[PDB]
Design a protein around this nucleic acid. Structure first.
Lengths: 501, 71
RNA sequence: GCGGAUUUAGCUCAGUUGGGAGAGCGCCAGACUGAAGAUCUGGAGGUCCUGUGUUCGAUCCACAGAAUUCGCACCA
């Protein structure tokens, strides 16, 4: 009759959420203090009246708000992981805000007590230390100085959750309709399209009708009476692949079998409403206003790709990244090979789509060979940024070195001996300045400053040059007459306005 | 049904490209690919590489336009 | 620079008996045609490069000058 006191590991990033869980798991594998316990995809057990204590392996990118329920939080007791050297941070106060609103009794785990200067560490013992005192009481919370890697302070932490877990909420409830999310939309060997689920609160029955979210819209499906609808992982005894169960409870992982669930999406609710139709219209409606005035310019957008082991985790991180205002591209299921090339196709235009940003998914052997190129980055935790910085360095690296030509400045050129005339392709040596194309040519200051011609095209050996300086000696093409001679000193005409620079 | 998000902004002609296509520099900003209208091609009208023309631009494609008025 | 050629109607050119200023085209009109076109006809349309001189008289000859063009000469 007594169920599991649902607990979640809340706090700031890199404070010791995953590492505290790795020690409660290391003493679970070890004999004496525990033993042969059942494996769940992210949960453990119950108080002195049954097993151990259920720690929910928090949604992939510290979401916690997904672990909600019908009215409040899906968690009974909660454990807040804070750092000893840092103190209370902005994500720790966001954790206290979701703790007082859902009315869930919290315990504070002040992690990394092995990090402060000159502190002797006794492995796996009980601790007695103080620190962050202005934020504790009996009306507030009980603080315990723990070390996730060493294991000290864990004996009083599991005891502090026990003095807080003696409630009636482990029996009575579960009555309301099942609120949760799926895990994956895959194909089984003994059946067709199967769907594993994570249920936050409530009970699913063997003949329960559940509304699910597809690519198009809202379509419901009855849980198959013929065959096995509720399929849990068979207990430690070898028989058939899975086993039939009747009614799963709050905090259970179960593989469901229904009818048409082929185009059923990733990140859907176990009460459902999803579409790609709205997100395509919401993006097109804001892009139609941005392209009605934009009959002219450019700049532009985002990326990010989410994929998880659980959808109670995908839906969680999507809602948490939409809180940080970082938009998403793909939330589908598959690896790479054909995804690594579509990533390299969109890097040519704007490098803002240059990354195949993976998470909890396995990278293929055929994919590893196409990731060998550096132009594309591969992430297995997931974010962006580096993207809009790559295209910024692309256009800014080509606009600055392209300045050299124009402006009628001073330049003198002397025509060499025995060089042809018609459309005057004559060999000429530059004396001073930079003689450019389109620059006007004049006669000597000894005579009158009359218009002799203008430079057509300059040619140094083989190369067609625009600017000739110092004394390069090239084949100058110019529109001249008998006004030009061989060995004459020509000066470029500074128009009286451009003369005074 | 026809959408009314079509603009009638002016512009000056720049380059004379083949098959009745021009470069047309807009008085608003940059330049579009602007072709001559089916109304103007039937009434002939020879456009020189430097005339003032009104462009019928569609919001779906910024690079494409259409010459409506003659001079 | 020297030497030569050329300089007449809007254009293109003829015009040495020193005495008439002219042709084609064009332009305008007429005739005609339905009409327009062509064609035919008719008209207007000149500092004959400019000045001076020669002569009875000068587009026509002499002298001087200017302009065009060609050859030649000259050229850091």
């Amino acid at each position: 009759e007594p169920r599991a006191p649902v607990v979640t590991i809340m706090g700031h990033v890199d404070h010791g959420k995953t590492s505290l869980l790795e020690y409660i798991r290391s003493t679970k594998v070890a004999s004496g203090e525990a033993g042969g316990i059942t494996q769940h995809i992210g949960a453990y057990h119950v108080e002195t009246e049954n097993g151990m204590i259920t720690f929910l392996d928090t949604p992939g990118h510290a979401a916690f708000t997904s672990m909600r329920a019908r009215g409040a939080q899906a968690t009974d007791i909660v454990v807040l992981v804070v750092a000893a050297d840092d103190g209370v941070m902005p994500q720790t106060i966001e954790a206290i805000q979701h703790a007082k609103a859902a009315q869930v009794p919290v315990v504070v785990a002040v992690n990394k007590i092995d990090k402060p200067e000159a502190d002797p560490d006794r492995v796996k013992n009980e601790l007695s230390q103080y620190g962050i005192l202005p934020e504790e009481w009996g009306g507030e919370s009980q603080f315990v100085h723990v070390s996730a890697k060493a294991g000290t302070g864990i004996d009083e932490l599991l005891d502090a959750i026990l003095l807080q877990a003696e409630v009636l909420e482990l029996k009575a409830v579960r009555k309301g309709m099942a609120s949760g999310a799926v895990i994956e939309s895959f194909l089984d060997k003994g059946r067709g399209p199967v769907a594993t689920v994570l249920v936050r609160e409530g009970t699913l029955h063997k003949g329960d009708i559940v509304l699910c979210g597809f690519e198009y819209g809202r379509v419901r499906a009855m849980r198959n009476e013929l065959g096995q609808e509720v399929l849990e992982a068979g207990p430690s005894i070898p028989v058939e692949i899975l086993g039939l169960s009747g009614v799963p409870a709050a905090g259970d992982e179960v593989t469901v079998v229904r009818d048409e669930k082929k185009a059923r999406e990733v990140a859907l609710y176990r009460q459902g409403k999803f579409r790609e139709v709205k997100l395509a219209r919401q993006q097109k409606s804001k892009l139609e206003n941005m392209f009605a005035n934009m009959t002219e310019g450019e700049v532009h957008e985002v990326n990010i790709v989410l994929k998880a082991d659980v959808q109670g985790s995908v839906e969680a991180i999507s809602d948490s990244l939409l809180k940080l205002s970082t938009d998403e591209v793909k939330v589908k299921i598959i690896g790479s090979g054909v995804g690594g090339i579509t990533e390299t196709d969109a890097t040519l235009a704007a490098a803002s789509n240059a990354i195949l940003v993976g998470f909890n998914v396995r990278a293929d052997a055929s994919a590893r060979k196409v990731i060998e190129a550096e132009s594309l980055d591969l992430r297995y935790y997931s974010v962006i940024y580096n993207l809009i910085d790559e295209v910024k360095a692309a256009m800014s690296g080509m606009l600055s070195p392209e300045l050299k030509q124009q402006i009628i400045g001073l330049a003198e050129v002397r025509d060499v001996f025995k060089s042809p005339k018609f459309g005057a392709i004559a060999g000429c040596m530059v004396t001073e300045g930079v003689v450019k194309r389109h620059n006007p040519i004049r006669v000597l200051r000894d005579n009158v400053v009359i218009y002799e011609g203008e430079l057509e095209s300059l040619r140094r050996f083989k190369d067609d040059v625009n600017e000739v300086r110092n004394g390069m000696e090239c084949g100058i093409g110019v529109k001249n007459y008998n006004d030009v001679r061989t060995g004459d000193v020509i000066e470029v005409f500074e128009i009286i306005e451009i003369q005074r620079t | 049904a026809k959408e009314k998000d079509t603009i009638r902004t002016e512009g000056v002609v720049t380059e004379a490209l083949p098959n009745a296509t021009f470069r047309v520099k807009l008085d608003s900003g940059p330049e579009i690919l602007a072709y001559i209208s089916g109304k103007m091609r039937m009434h002939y009208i020879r456009i020189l590489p430097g005339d003032r023309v009104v462009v019928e631009i569609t919001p779906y494609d910024p690079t494409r336009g259409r010459i409506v008025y003659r001079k």
